Amino acid sequence: YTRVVWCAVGPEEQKKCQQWSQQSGQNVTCATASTTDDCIVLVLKGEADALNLDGGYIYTAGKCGLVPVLAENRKSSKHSSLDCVLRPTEGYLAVAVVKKANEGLTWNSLKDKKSCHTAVDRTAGWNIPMGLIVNQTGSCAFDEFFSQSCAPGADPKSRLCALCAGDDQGLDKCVPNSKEKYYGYTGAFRCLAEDVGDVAFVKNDTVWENTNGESTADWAKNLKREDFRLLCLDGTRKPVTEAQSCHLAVAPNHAVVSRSDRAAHVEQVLLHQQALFGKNGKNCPDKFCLFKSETKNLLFNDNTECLAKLGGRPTYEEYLGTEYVTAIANLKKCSLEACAF
Ligand SMILES: *[C@@H]1O[C@H](CO)[C@@H](O[C@@H]2O[C@H](CO)[C@@H](O[C@@H]3O[C@H](CO)[C@@H](O[C@H]4O[C@H](CO)[C@@H](O[C@H]5O[C@H](CO)[C@@H](O[C@@H]6O[C@H](CO)[C@@H](O)[C@H](O)[C@@H]6O)[C@H](O)[C@@H]5O)[C@H](O)[C@@H]4O)[C@H](O)[C@@H]3O)[C@H](O)[C@H]2NC(C)=O)[C@H](O)[C@H]1NC(C)=O
Ligand SMILES: *[C@@H]1O[C@H](CO)[C@@H](O[C@@H]2O[C@H](CO)[C@@H](O[C@@H]3O[C@H](CO)[C@@H](O)[C@H](O)[C@@H]3O)[C@H](O)[C@H]2NC(C)=O)[C@H](O)[C@H]1NC(C)=O
Ligand SMILES: COc1ccc2c(c1)c(CC(=O)O)c(C)n2C(=O)c1ccc(Cl)cc1
Ligand SMILES: *[C@@H]1O[C@H](CO)[C@@H](O)[C@H](O)[C@H]1NC(C)=O
Ligand SMILES: [Fe+3]
Ligand SMILES: [Zn+2]
Ligand SMILES: [Zn+2]
């Protein structure tokens, strides 16, 4: 009676779900879809129960009447008086990153350059950057601003995927799941790292997690923090040590959403699943760890300490915040009252 069905996006998140499933006593089983939007639809239909989402998609899902249930929490200095689950989230910092070697590249000369985005409609990788740029340009022509990009989820032979690489066998070019090589936080940063783009729109954490031997991967093991700069909105450039005074915005933590008729039931099971497989669980890191996959962020971000209860029972609008939700509306009028599905 108590069983939850997770929705996995793409073949890699599937395999990871399958393990979680088997290690759970079929307390959690799996559904798989090729895109986040398709997983949202599975959940509305009632064939899946839940998944973890970037704030940009929480805005989609919430118009269709889905609700935040538990949020991700990463390591925190302040607020250490308290327990992670009852501990307040903070929100990550969205940044624009460049090679140090590229002098002359400022927030003011981004026109006609090459760009690396997490995916279309995501907070740090899309809504923040393109919102600012529509504003400063007064045009909805965000498809003509950069010469070429990789923006997973756009038309495959527009210039917005022009830089995307697809899977081993060259298939799936710019699909929005991890088969695409430059998908998500890690892929967008790899995109700038390998000098395919001139800038990448990721979050502060991503730079740290993938420089200075912090990530054991082939493309990144020789990357070094001092080789990068952040672009600030006042036209200057700073070390990645200054993210606190040189970001584009702060962003709501990714959160697990479900259909509201299912929210209590999902919350109940997951809090128990993190007790077995979480950051200090009975069975992690012995048998299985929910918050770990090789710097991939599969199902969850790897820097997740825990899933946190929500303060005060949010609506998705309260959780996303008033500031970020007007940002999104203003952008969507470019490309008020109806589900996308
Ligand atoms: C932008 O994002 C970054 C990435 O998250 C973030 O920095 C983190 O800051 C948090 C809290 O402010 C900090 O918290 C700690 O938890 C750590 C676990 O993550 C504990 O540290 C130990 O474990 C980690 C992981 O294995 C080791 O990580 C390394 O990275 C750095 C540099 O590569 C080095 O660590 C340090 O060495 C200095 C020496 O002076 C020392 O002062 C520090 O305390 C630390 O030890 C190290 O070379 C490693 O390669 C590390 O070795 C430790 O053994 C720790 O107990 C503490 O509670 C977290 O570590 C930071 N993340 C990382 C990976 O650097 C920024 O805060 C974000 N900035 C903004 C503005 O939001
Ligand atoms: C790009 O520009 C648009 C258009 O201005 C930005 O939206 C505007 O920004 C501010 C900040 O949220 C909004 O004003 C605020 O509204 C509430 C009540 O209206 C008020 O109490 C707040 O203190 C604040 O004044 C304003 O409503 C909004 N304007 C419109 C027409 O919606 C948008 O945020 C920008 N996009 C990005 C990513 O910056
Ligand atoms: C009405 O009470 C709150 C409480 C928290 C808030 C906001 C409003 C708004 C803004 C708004 O929508 O106007 C934001 C952005 N909040 C946060 O980001 C935040 C982050 C971490 C924690 Cl632990 C708590 C809150
Ligand atoms: C599965 O769920 C049942 C109900 O709580 C519980 O008895 C059991 O401990 C759970 N097993 C695991 C491994 O989650
Ligand atoms: Fe995000
Ligand atoms: Zn700020
Ligand atoms: Zn409320």
Swiss-Prot record:
Family named by the database record: Belongs to the transferrin family.
Subcellular location: Secreted; Cytoplasmic granule
Function, in words: Transferrins are iron binding transport proteins which can bind two Fe(3+) ions in association with the binding of an anion, usually bicarbonate. Lactoferricin binds to the bacterial surface and is crucial for the bactericidal functions. Has some antiviral activity against papillomavirus infection. N-terminal region shows strong antifungal activity against C.albicans. Contains two BBXB heparin-binding consensus sequences that appear to form the predominate functional GAG-binding site.
Protein name: Lactotransferrin
Domain named Transferrin-like: residues: 4-333
Binding site for Fe(3+) 2: 54, 92, 185, 254
Subunit relationships: Monomer. Found in a complex with LTF, CLU, EPPIN and SEMG1. Found in a complex with MPO and LTF; interacts directly with CP, allows Fe(3+) incorporation into LTF and activation of CP ferroxidase activity.
Full-protein interval shown: 361 to 705 of 708
Modification(s) after translation: Poly-N-acetyllactosaminic carbohydrate moiety seems to be needed for TLR4 activation.
Annotated organism of origin: Bos taurus
Gene behind the chain: LTF
Cysteines paired by S-S bonds: 7-39, 17-30, 64-339, 84-306, 116-191, 140-334, 150-164, 161-174, 232-246, 284-289
Sugar-modified residues: 27, 135, 204
Residues where hydrogencarbonate 2 binds: 118, 122, 124-125
